[PDB]
Design a protein around this ligand. Structure first.
Ligand SMILES: CC(C)CCC[C@@H](C)[C@H]1CC[C@H]2[C@@H]3CC=C4C[C@@H](OC(=O)CCC(=O)O)CC[C@]4(C)[C@H]3CC[C@]12C
Ligand SMILES: CC(C)CCC[C@@H](C)[C@H]1CC[C@H]2[C@@H]3CC=C4C[C@@H](OC(=O)CCC(=O)O)CC[C@]4(C)[C@H]3CC[C@]12C
Ligand SMILES: CC(C)CCC[C@@H](C)[C@H]1CC[C@H]2[C@@H]3CC=C4C[C@@H](OC(=O)CCC(=O)O)CC[C@]4(C)[C@H]3CC[C@]12C
Ligand SMILES: CC(C)CCC[C@@H](C)[C@H]1CC[C@H]2[C@@H]3CC=C4C[C@@H](OC(=O)CCC(=O)O)CC[C@]4(C)[C@H]3CC[C@]12C
Ligand SMILES: CCCCCCCCCCCCCCCC
Ligand SMILES: CCCCCCCCCCCCCCCC
Ligand SMILES: CCCCCCCCCCCCCCCC
Ligand SMILES: [Ca+2]
Lengths: 72, 162, 70, 136, 72, 134, 387
């Protein structure tokens, strides 16, 4: 928010701010959030959940017949 | 005959751009890979009706030179439609394994063919219901390399046998 | 109360339910344009937009009536 | 069916064992299954013969006292519900039971042969199995 | 149902004694680093290296990394 | 026996005083630092005699210690701004807790699980780094 | 302060949301003593916030795997796996169409060159300079750069217009928009022209959509074995796009209603004698972007102190902590739920789609032309498919 506030309160190159000017520069920060914190970070959490391998499973075809529901 | 003639069929009716280009690409492969061993002939007479018989010995006398010939027919589009002649060709089948790819292919090939989609689809269905053993070779492969190697290896087997 | 021959269920035609979805989006823009000033103060624009409330109620109250009938 | 749907068997035993009758009499084998719900209990709504012959497919052995074993009873409910090496009938059922014993050792060798045969009864056919009791 | 969620998820924190030791070694390494490198900054209450938040001690810097890990 | 020197030297890092450089605690701990690095070298040399030429990380730590103890004890002065040199060569000692990653066959199996999971998200951590660049 | 029970289940809800949990910890170190307080707050952040992400991620992840195997959700995936088969085999069947004055003399050799493998590595070695020309524009950059990089648009805009022609007047206007990134190429070539014109009429803000051409460097993945994994992600994201767009729009109709409701309660009431904060509720653009602070949950704290002293103080006006609690609790876990369902449904599809290529194109045909390291998600979602 302190970067949103400065990015809104913006006037020109080598000029001090002016509050609530350029309030349309808050679209750069909702399009950034919808992409990187919401979408992309949840691609990382989901490529690790989806592609997670059991630590060690080398017990005769991993207990050839008896498996997760069958063994436990 | 000395060498069994090569005749291609299966996508759709000949004359349509789809089957025309399919066969012409396959024959370009045959030429530029086997350059100096196969002579390509274009046929405009109805072989099934055997000037009709004027070209049959012409095919023979290129087939009577210990060399393979590819038959660019333009009226035969069925295995049973040539079950009567004594040519005994090798029937390589350029197979399409789904109607949907067929409609997409014909539609994507301009708009002049788009007015003839239904008839080509019907003839392709008719070909599909034909029994598989009526074709000497099956080519349902997608990549040019795969079907080219398949046909090349079969022709190589024939050439080593004779 | 349950009287048939509504002649109202026939009114739920597709030209009729895309004007309610048009008055709602219009309504959602009037609410978007209002600015809230501290102590009974009102901007001149927000005094104009307060004149549309009888219309938006007029349409939304029409729908309840025509639906509780149909 | 999972370990969730199996603690019920531990629970439902308690209301009719009352810390005493672990050799529980076999009348409850129908009563217990109706009380419970699928996928462990048969259920009280539709006990239909094709549904119930799963219990006949679950050829639980009986002793001289018309009694069953808690450990043995628990496995047979598992084995039919999870379709673990379940055959249609005949000695081919026991042919897979040899594996049913064998597979256990390579996983849990800590079990003896009695408790192996407790987990895999391999009932002898001439005895009236629980399924055969109610099939007759 | 609240106890099985707790039981199931705390049993699987007991099957991974070493996964919460690479994380406790990340917090160890950084801590040490912050000590030698950031340890002699003079505390100024205007800044965020306060008397509360600093690198002057192992536990004073382990709290700085936990305060920072939790996004604060 | 090595693995306890690893875990006793890594606590000699957590006890040092960052501000009071020459406190009495730091004077003792700078006698331990010779003892701990003496063990590591005579665990490296016998290892490199009996194996021939992770072990780079061990190699760096022992050299970084000797170089620090050499140029500080030998002269320590007469070079431009060389107090910062040992102060930046002793930050290599922080790698001593990292020597235990491969000494424990079960901790190494967890480190190789993080690395193997950093390679699954790597063709998306390049798309992420390219969208974050646009 | 934990004065009451209602003042304590809000000071501890603040710390679990991990907003300002250190000012709470640093107050009770001054007030009481810094020896025992850490036993209250570290076990509270770990259990309350970290250990509840583990449960929420786990409970959600299992729920998304049980729903992927619903009959209504396999039926709509096999209908996606099918059109991927058609498109895959049709590509080979369009490869066979390999036809061997200026109507047929230039348009024959152009499309020969402009599809050659030395052409791609020219454009992608020339879009890797356009994305390093606009990567060095800093502030106060030397005067030679400002002019040098000023021509660097026109050299690149003109040249990328040159290759926009060879794909149009050498391969076809109608037969120009059949590829995805080929439509992307048009999207920014007109877009880059728009910046040029718009900057002459209004010098200043130059948001500059010509670095969007850097998205063609993603096609360097085609030369790697990581194209199937990545194309199947976009193929799955594009198929389920009317359900992501109509799901970002229900996450926007609940930001609006809330923003609206936030103006009714705190509109015009943030005129404090210090000055109205930047996180107002007075106008709609400022009410939307402070509900977006509370949803993403960062400094929902400070917006609540203003919203409490707005309606009174720590007094008859602290009933307004319900707005900032219901809204940072149902946006902390509703954005995670929505945006992880989008990223798990469309990412477990791109894991079976890229697996039914290797398991056909390298297992099914390679034979008929003559487990095995399955993750926990893959095994458990196959036992759930076999019921
Ligand atoms: C495929 C991904 C990587 C593309 C990401 C870019 C777009 C999705 C976003 C990112 C930044 C956004 C822009 C950020 C700011 C502005 C300026 C805004 O208008 C202004 O403020 C310009 C004039 C002025 O400053 O007065 C109009 C929307 C726009 C172009 C936004 C439109 C959407 C953009 C291009
Ligand atoms: C998932 C877990 C089991 C992995 C291992 C634990 C870690 C998550 C670390 C990161 C933050 C660490 C904490 C950061 C700060 C402190 C305060 C510290 O406090 C003191 O010694 C005195 C008071 C002060 O901090 O000033 C005691 C250790 C402790 C609780 C640390 C214990 C170990 C923690 C929880
Ligand atoms: C808590 C233990 C079990 C952890 C494992 C490591 C310990 C066996 C040893 C290894 C090195 C030891 C340190 C070596 C030297 C010193 C200096 C010693 O003397 C002082 O500096 C005190 C001076 C004063 O009284 O002001 C205080 C303990 C301490 C930090 C020792 C604390 C205990 C340590 C960490
Ligand atoms: C090929 C692409 C993907 C990467 C290109 C490199 C840029 C991402 C970075 C790397 C180094 C950066 C430079 C590092 C240091 C400086 C000095 C600094 O500027 C000054 O020296 C201040 C005075 C002035 O020149 O205005 C900031 C800009 C600049 C040129 C940076 C500009 C952007 C650069 C070239
Ligand atoms: C406050 C004076 C008028 C400001 C007008 C700004 C218009 C653009 C608003 C952008 C922020 C709202 C984004 C909505 C979607 C999240
Ligand atoms: C749910 C917490 C709200 C706080 C309300 C404070 C009440 C004090 C009187
Ligand atoms: C046929 C297109 C292939 C593209 C290959 C690279 C794709 C990388 C993933 C792109 C994800 C974009 C998400 C944008 C934000 C919603
Ligand atoms: Ca925060």
């Amino acid at each position: 928010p302190q970067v949103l506030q400065h990015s809104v309160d913006v006037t020109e190159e080598d000029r001090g701010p002016s509050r609530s000017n350029r309030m349309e520069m808050s679209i750069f920060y909702v399009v950034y959030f919808v992409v990187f914190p919401f979408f992309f970070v949840n691609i990382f959490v989901a490529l690790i959940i989806i592609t997670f391998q059991e630590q060690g499973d080398k017990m005769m075809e991993e207990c050839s017949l008896e498996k997760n529901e069958r063994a436990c | 005959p000395s060498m069994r003639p090569i005749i291609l069929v299966g996508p759709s009716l000949k004359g349509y751009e789809v089957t025309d280009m399919m066969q012409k690409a396959l024959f370009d492969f045959l030429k530029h890979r086997f350059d100096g061993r196969i002579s390509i002939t274009r046929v405009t007479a109805d072989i099934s009706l055997a000037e009709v018989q004027s070209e049959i010995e012409r095919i023979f006398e290129l087939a009577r030179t210990l060399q393979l010939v590819a038959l660019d027919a333009d009226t035969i589009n069925h295995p049973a439609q040539l079950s009567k002649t004594s040519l005994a060709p090798i029937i390589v089948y350029i197979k399409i394994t789904s109607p949907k790819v067929l409609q997409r292919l014909i539609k994507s090939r301009g708009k002049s063919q788009s007015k003839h989609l239904n008839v080509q689809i019907a003839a392709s269905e008719k070909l599909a219901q034909c029994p598989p053993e009526m074709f000497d070779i099956i080519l349902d492969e997608n990549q040019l390399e795969d079907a080219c190697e398949h046909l090349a290896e079969y022709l190589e087997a024939y050439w080593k046998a004779t | 109360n349950i009287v048939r021959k509504y002649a109202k269920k026939l009114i739920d035609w597709p030209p009729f339910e895309y004007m309610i979805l048009a008055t709602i989006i219009a309504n959602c823009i009037v609410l978007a344009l209002e600015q809230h000033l501290p102590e009974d103060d009102k901007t001149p624009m927000s005094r104009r937009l307060e004149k549309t409330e009888p219309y938006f109620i007029g349409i939304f109250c029409f729908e309840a009536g025509i639906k509780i009938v149909a | 069916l999972g370990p969730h749907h199996l603690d019920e068997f531990v629970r439902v035993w308690a209301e009719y064992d009352r810390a005493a009758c672990g050799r529980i009499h076999y009348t409850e084998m129908y009563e217990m299954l109706t009380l419970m719900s699928p996928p462990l209990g048969l259920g009280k709504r539709c006990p239909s013969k094709v549904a119930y012959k799963r219990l006949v497919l679950m050829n639980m052995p009986v002793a001289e006292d018309m009694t069953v074993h808690f450990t043995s009873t628990l496995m047979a409910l598992i084995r039919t519900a999870l379709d673990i090496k379940i055959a249609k009938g005949g000695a081919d059922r026991q042919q897979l039971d040899s594996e049913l014993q064998k597979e256990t050792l390579a996983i849990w060798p800590h079990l003896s042969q009695k408790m192996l045969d407790l987990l895999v009864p391999m009932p002898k056919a001439s005895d009236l199995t629980v399924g055969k009791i109610y099939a007759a | 149902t609240i106890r099985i969620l707790l039981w199931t998820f705390v049993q699987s924190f007991k099957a991974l004694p070493y996964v919460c030791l690479l994380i406790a070694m990340l917090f160890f390494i950084y801590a040490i680093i912050g000590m030698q490198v950031f340890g002699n900054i003079k505390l100024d209450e205007e800044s965020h290296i306060n008397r509360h938040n600093n690198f002057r001690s192992f536990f004073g810097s382990l709290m700085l990394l936990f305060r920072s890990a939790t996004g604060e | 026996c090595i693995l306890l020197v690893i875990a006793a030297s890594s606590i000699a890092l957590a006890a040092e005083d960052p501000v009071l450089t020459n406190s009495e605690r730091n004077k003792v701990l700078r006698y331990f630092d010779y003892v701990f690095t003496g063990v590591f070298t005579f665990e490296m040399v016998i290892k490199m005699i009996d194996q021939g030429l992770w072990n780079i990380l061990d190699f760096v730590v022992v050299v970084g210690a000797l170089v620090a103890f050499a140029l500080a004890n030998a002269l320590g002065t007469n070079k431009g701004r060389d107090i910062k040199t040992i102060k930046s060569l002793r930050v290599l000692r922080v790698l001593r807790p990292l020597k235990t990653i491969k000494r424990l066959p079960k901790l190494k199996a967890v480190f190789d699980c993080v690395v193997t999971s950093l390679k699954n998200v790597f063709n998306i951590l390049i798309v992420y780094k390219l969208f974050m660049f646009i | 302060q934990f004065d009451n029970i209602l003042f304590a289940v809000l000071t501890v809800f603040q710390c679990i949301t991990m907003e300002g949990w250190t000012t709470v910890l640093y107050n009770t170190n001054d007030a009481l003593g810094a020896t025992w307080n850490w036993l209250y707050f570290i076990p509270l952040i770990i259990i309350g916030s970290f250990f509840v992400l583990n449960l929420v991620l786990g409970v959600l992840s299992g729920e998304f795997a049980k729903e992927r195997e619903r009959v209504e959700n396999r039926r709509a995936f096999m209908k996606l796996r099918r059109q991927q088969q058609i498109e895959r085999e049709l590509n080979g069947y369009r490869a066979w169409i390999d036809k061997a004055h200026k109507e047929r003399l230039l348009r024959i050799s152009i499309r020969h060159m402009v599809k050659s493998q030395v052409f791609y590595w020219i454009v992608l070695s020339l879009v890797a300079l356009n994305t390093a020309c606009v990567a060095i524009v800093h502030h106060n950059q030397p005067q030679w750069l400002t002019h040098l990089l000023y021509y660097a648009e026109f050299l690149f805009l003109g040249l990328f217009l040159l290759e926009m022609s060879l794909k149009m007047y050498g391969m076809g206007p109608r037969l120009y928009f059949h590829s995805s990134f080929n439509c992307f190429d048009f999207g920014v070539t007109v877009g880059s022209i728009f910046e040029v014109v718009w900057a002459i009429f209004r010098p200043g803000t130059s948001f500059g959509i010509s670095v969007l051409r850097a998205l063609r460097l993603l096609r360097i993945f085609k030369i790697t074995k990581y194209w199937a994994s990545l194309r199947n992600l976009v193929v799955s994201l594009m198929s389920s796009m009317k359900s992501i767009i109509s799901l970002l729009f229900l996450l926007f109709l609940f930001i609006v209603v809330f923003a609206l409701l936030g103006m009714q309660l705190f509109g015009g009431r943030f005129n404090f004698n210090d000055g109205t904060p930047s996180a107002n509720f007075d106008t709609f653009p400022a009410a939307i972007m402070t509900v977006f602070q509370i949803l993403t949950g960062e400094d929902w704290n400070e917006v609540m102190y203003n919203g409490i002293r707005s309606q009174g103080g720590v007094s008859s006006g602290m009933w307004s902590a319900i707005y900032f609690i219901v809204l940072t609790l149902f946006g902390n876990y509703t954005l995670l739920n929505v945006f992880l369902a989008i990223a798990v449904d469309n990412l477990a599809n791109a894991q079976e789609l890229t697996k039914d290529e290797q398991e056909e194109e390298e297992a099914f045909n390679q034979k008929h032309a003559l487990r095995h390291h399955m993750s926990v998600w893959e095994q458990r979602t196959s036992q759930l498919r076999k019921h």
